Amino acid sequence: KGEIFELKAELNNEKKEKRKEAVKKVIAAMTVGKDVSSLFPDVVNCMQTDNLELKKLVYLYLMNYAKSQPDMAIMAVNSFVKDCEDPNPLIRALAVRTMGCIRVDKITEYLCEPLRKCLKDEDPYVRKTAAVCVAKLHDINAQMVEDQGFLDSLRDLIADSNPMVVANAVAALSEISESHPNSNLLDLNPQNINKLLTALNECTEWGQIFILDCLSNYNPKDDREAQSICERVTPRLSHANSAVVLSAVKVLMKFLELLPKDSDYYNMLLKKLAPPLVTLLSGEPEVQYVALRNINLIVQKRPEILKQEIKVFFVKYNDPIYVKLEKLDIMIRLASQANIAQVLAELKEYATEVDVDFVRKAVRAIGRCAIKVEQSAERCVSTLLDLIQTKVNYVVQEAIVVIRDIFRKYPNKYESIIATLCENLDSLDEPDARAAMIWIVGEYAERIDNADELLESFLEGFHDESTQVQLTLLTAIVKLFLKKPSETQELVQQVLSLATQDSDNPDLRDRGYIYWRLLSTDPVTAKEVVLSEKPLISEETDLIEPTLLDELICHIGSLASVYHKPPNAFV
Amino acid sequence: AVSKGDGMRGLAVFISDIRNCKSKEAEIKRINKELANIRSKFKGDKALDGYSKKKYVCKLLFIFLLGHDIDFGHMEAVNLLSSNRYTEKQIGYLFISVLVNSNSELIRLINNAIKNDLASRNPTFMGLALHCIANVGSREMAEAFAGEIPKILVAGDTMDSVKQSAALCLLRLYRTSPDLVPMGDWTSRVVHLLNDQHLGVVTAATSLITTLAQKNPEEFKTSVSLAVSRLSRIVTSASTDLQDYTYYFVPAPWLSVKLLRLLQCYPPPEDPAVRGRLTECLETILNKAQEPPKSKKVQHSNAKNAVLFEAISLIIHHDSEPNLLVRACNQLGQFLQHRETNLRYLALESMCTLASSEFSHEAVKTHIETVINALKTERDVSVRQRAVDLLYAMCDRSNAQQIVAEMLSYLETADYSIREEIVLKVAILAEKYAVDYTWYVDTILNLIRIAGDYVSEEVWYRVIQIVINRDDVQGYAAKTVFEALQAPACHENLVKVGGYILGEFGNLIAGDPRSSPLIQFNLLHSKFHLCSVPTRALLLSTYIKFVNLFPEVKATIQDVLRSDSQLKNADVELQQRAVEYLRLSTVASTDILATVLEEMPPFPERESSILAKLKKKKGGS
Amino acid sequence: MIRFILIQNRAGKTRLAKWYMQFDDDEKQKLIEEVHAVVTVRDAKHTNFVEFRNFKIIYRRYAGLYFCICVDVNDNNLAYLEAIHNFVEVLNEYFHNVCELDLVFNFYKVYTVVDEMFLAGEIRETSQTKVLKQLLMLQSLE
Amino acid sequence: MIGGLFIYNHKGEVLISRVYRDDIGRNAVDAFRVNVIHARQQVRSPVTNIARTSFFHVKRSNIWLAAVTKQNVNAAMVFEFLYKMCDVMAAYFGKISEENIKNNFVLIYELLDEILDFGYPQNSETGALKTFITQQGIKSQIGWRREGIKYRRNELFLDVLESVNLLMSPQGQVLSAHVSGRVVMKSYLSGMPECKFGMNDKIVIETSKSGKQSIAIDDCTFHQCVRLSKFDSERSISFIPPDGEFELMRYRTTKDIILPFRVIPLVREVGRTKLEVKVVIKSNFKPSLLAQKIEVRIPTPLNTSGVQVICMKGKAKYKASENAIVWKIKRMAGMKESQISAEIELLPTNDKKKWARPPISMNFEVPFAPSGLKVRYLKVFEPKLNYSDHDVIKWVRYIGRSGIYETRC
Amino acid sequence: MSQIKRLLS
């Protein structure tokens, strides 16, 4: 007979040499699933000791157990308060950091004063602790904290000596002021801004983050105030620690929407913002990602900042895949009418390489580059054909589609190289591609004598095709028959038969009928209808609504800068 | 009485010291320590005595069964195999049974020990060997002893405990090297084992006879006549007979179940008398099942029902005399009713099998209520499926509306791997067993409604198909669709089915201003700008059919199509549909347009290709 | 056919493992882990049978011990559910008021019991009477 | 801010668990496990959202460690903190391995409650942390090629050859599955080039693909020429390639497999007279790619006497030759589905059937690795000849074959 | 977990 019954004895033995060594084992089997609890009291009264090693041990037991059994936790109170007096600042701070972790409406009252004392303890390590304990308690009684004055108590700690405390107070205080938006627990007036615009030059790394994240919410309502506030955070654009760099950028980006373009300052706060977030791309992969998601935002709202900087967003062969993807998007966004030369080259490379799933992403970009840089569409089509000559299937199939849509977006202009492309009807397997080719043959049929057996070959396996090609091929054959009647009298029949009789996709069957009925009873209108210049297709979004973009430039540091969703889409 | 030797302190200690261990790495230290001590007790001058060998080996076997490996001790183990002492032979054989090797020498050193023991005509030893042969089954052994095992098995003077093990040993050899197990003279004299005084023998012989009879049915056909004679004699004589083999008041349940499984390897007894007795015997098994239980202990119940289920499986397997098929279906019926879970599961499984019988008179359909219930109540996704599966296999036109309902509610709260397969099963039963076609239509668009992610294209095509064919539903569908479409989520598959149904019909619900022409177009177009392209294409076809039907809304629809979003549409299919429809709402004669957009014929009743047919007197066509 | 018989506890420590087809150690191991991952998570509101790879598993808990028999899919569930049980009943007779410990400190004689009642994937002896009579005749053996 | 701090080993077993805000729970933890760690088709990212709960994570060795928040936290910050927490962790015990963490439960939990209060980071930098860390700290830590090969142009080929196996329940339970892997490199490139070969995760640390009623155990086996130096850093399998074609690595996964096809079998036994089968096949790889050479073998009864089907895509033949309907599809893309419907006339018979209905087997080929494997880069460095890594012609194909791919009917 | 509990009775 033993087990747990045996650890209870190992502790009680008044040999504080034995107690010490025994407690060790109990703390060890918490982190191994075993249900302790039967030993709670016996641990508590090991608390009554001097040995700083054995006490910060027992507190692990208590704390990783008041965030679990807060109801069996509060039975230690008289021993927690006792430790709030204890001369040793470590056991003072420890007693506070665990006491607040007891989440139960019943401790609001026990903790009141012990925290009040620790809030103005000699030692800053007790003070830094009590500061976030204030928050840890506003979580269980947001009133009691506004009342017992702990709020004005935090507001004191921001002026505190050592930054380690300031830092925590500024976070706790912002955490509350957020939970109560209207109550203006921060307020931030034009005068008490200088108050914390100074703690920013100290306040450890964290805390400079917490401070900057409060400054976001202020708004000078005065040009001269924004300018003399920006020139006070301009320096924080270096603190390694991308969390600072970004949070400062977040501030700067919101203030700089003040003063149109005069006073070199604006012209210069732009030039001043490039270097830092450029050198953000030189951090660890995870942070590169976060930067990139924000740079994506940034260059949309304020292009001018990362204009010359495109080379930086170029893909390195070993960038983690997520960085690669985000680099590419930004490459697109910076693709200037005066560097697609450089950019396409790069994309061409990416398509040449070996990460297949990105090769695809790369060619689609060449297409997007033809959209964004209107005057370059020709070189794009050039390189797409280069890639196509590679006869590498994954590449071709993605290229023929983009080509398809460049034709649809700029005149025809490329009737030339059309007869060529119909060299690749070899391995067009992917539906989207066949559909693209089948289409190109339909339009542009007057330029390919081939069209007949081109479209015919597709026809031979029609009830096995994509619903997409089936539909595209119906339109392409009809097109042909209005362009070259006779050469194709039999084809239109077969398609229309098959669409109508053989196909059981209802949408298809209809179009079988629509055409057949239109051709046979009014061909002079059939031609008026199915042909006729389609307009130049217009792209899609590109950017973001100017008003929601504005809403997450405001959030440049946060998760909302990563997902591009406003905070309301995660709570 | 005789004394009782055994114990091995060294081991116990090794275990305790190890079950001890203030860590998962002291465990690892205490091993290498004992390992190092054991080696260098073998690896020494004086070999050790049996007791010390036996023990150090056992300790190694234990270290292995912990998960550490063993690079030695096999030779010490083979020594043990030669011992006259049982407890020593035992550990040697156990050791080499669990830890085998490719070592050509050990393999044959061992085959020698085994050879000897087999030849010692000492039954305890013969067993130890027979077992090693059967726990190991190495090809190397089948070669050496496959020929001798049968020789033993059928010998008259062979102890019954050895007859048992020999038979199961042979079986393992047969599963190992079917080639080396011929079909000798022992056949008829193994079959004759079914009449052995000893029922443990009969039980073993039966497992062997059952596995041989599956690729050698003809050699063992003689076993049916017997398996019946025994099974009869078993389920008759009460509790005082077959003393040893009665378990919780159920006589030789396991041998029964085995004998009934054996009778399934064959067709109903070819001889009338035998077919009779076998059938009287099942009459009886079912008879005892309905009687007040001899005990209530779950053991008795499980043994009795183990035999009961098998006799039912033999009944379902044979599929003759309806009377037995019906009684079985009624006992399977009663199990479902009895509050439980093991039986509920088994009974549904058995019943579901009983449904592919052609002389039950469909007894299964009588229990629709009992099983619909099982499905309603039972938590436990397994019992819940085996039930749904029964309902699918017993659907006719009579209970389809009944089942489809219960089935839709199981869908509502089902795992997702179940969603798609339930959607089909349901869709099948409805387009197959429907009389009221408003109920088919209504049924299908529930599936679409809530469960829609799991309705495939074939399913929704088909209602559109079916609605175009049947006219007595075009109005009801146009109405019903219009109402399901009022929901703000509604799967995208509803928007497909609905838009089509209102482009064709729905002029025939545009009398009522509840659903005015303009009211419907606004309803569809609200779903447009957030549907897949295919759906938007479909919607566009719908839009122009409206320009035909309802000249009031031509004004409107016309410059939905005229707007950039459509005419400049980035997808080629969408931009075709737009430009064409716009163009023809403009150019076409009001007459010509009405022709082009006429009502689309019925859907051809697509039909099977005959893949094979009885032709030149055989299967394929 | 019985593929294997496991006896492992609520944590997955195997305490008897008779295998009835050739497996590697690496296989036998993964197998034992899987039988755990499957049996341990079922809460008696469920049933005593589970699809397991291409076979199925009959099993009943007894204290901290799961007694698992892996069988061919077409095998008689209730048959093997009681086999397991009368096997336990024999153990409790041999060891008198048996428990996990007896099965550990006595692991080596657990196997001789098992093989008396199951051999080569098939049931062997069913008669608690004879199987006990024998176990007690051995044990008197030098 | 930071609500939870979770550390897993490669397997995704939880090693360390710290909750700093009530919001969390058993929720976000399996959530991260089975969604990021056991991701399949999803390409992972540093931060991922799951059920209005954000997950920051970083891999250090084969160890995952993840921060959970339910708030809109400064994102850069959570990583900056995660980095510091590994730095500190390594100052107390070097490599950030599973061994070193299983050995420092206390040192770690104690470390956490000092580097991070109520989810607010707390500046570490090991600055005077000795006077706060009252706990110990148990530390711990070829394939030849001729000299002067010369080539016209420098090309290299990479075939990623996988064979996926599956036994699936009717209801769609994966009863068993395993990819058997193989990356073959054909290398026609000149000099003595050390080239680096980065892949995605999908494997962690032989037999010639065999077995039946035998258990697939995960593994991996490289070539002699393979330096595994940096495999705990993504992949950086560095090696100096034999000339021509060789087997760079041979593996087999059993975990997070992208089974390419579900077979949905709706049988239906209408007495012993006929038997009506409907079978669906669901492709469920990405739509942008095409399965090919597809066969579906529905077994028929031995007492079959008549068969008629209704094939959507493709054509089918009955083959009493070998007792089954053989449906062949020429090609189908990802995320589409197709159907076949057989009615099967059966000769009367007396019984004896038992059928045991074998599974519906598939055969197919696919342009992706079912293991989930993805070649992410392959850089060639050759310093004597210093030819540009960019002038090295590179092509890869993935060939994913069916093994024995059976769905029970 | 107390491995001495009887398996039966």
From TrEMBL, chain E:
It comes from the Eukaryota. It is found in: Cell membrane. This is cDNA, FLJ79547, highly similar to T-cell surface glycoprotein CD4. It comes from Homo sapiens (Human).
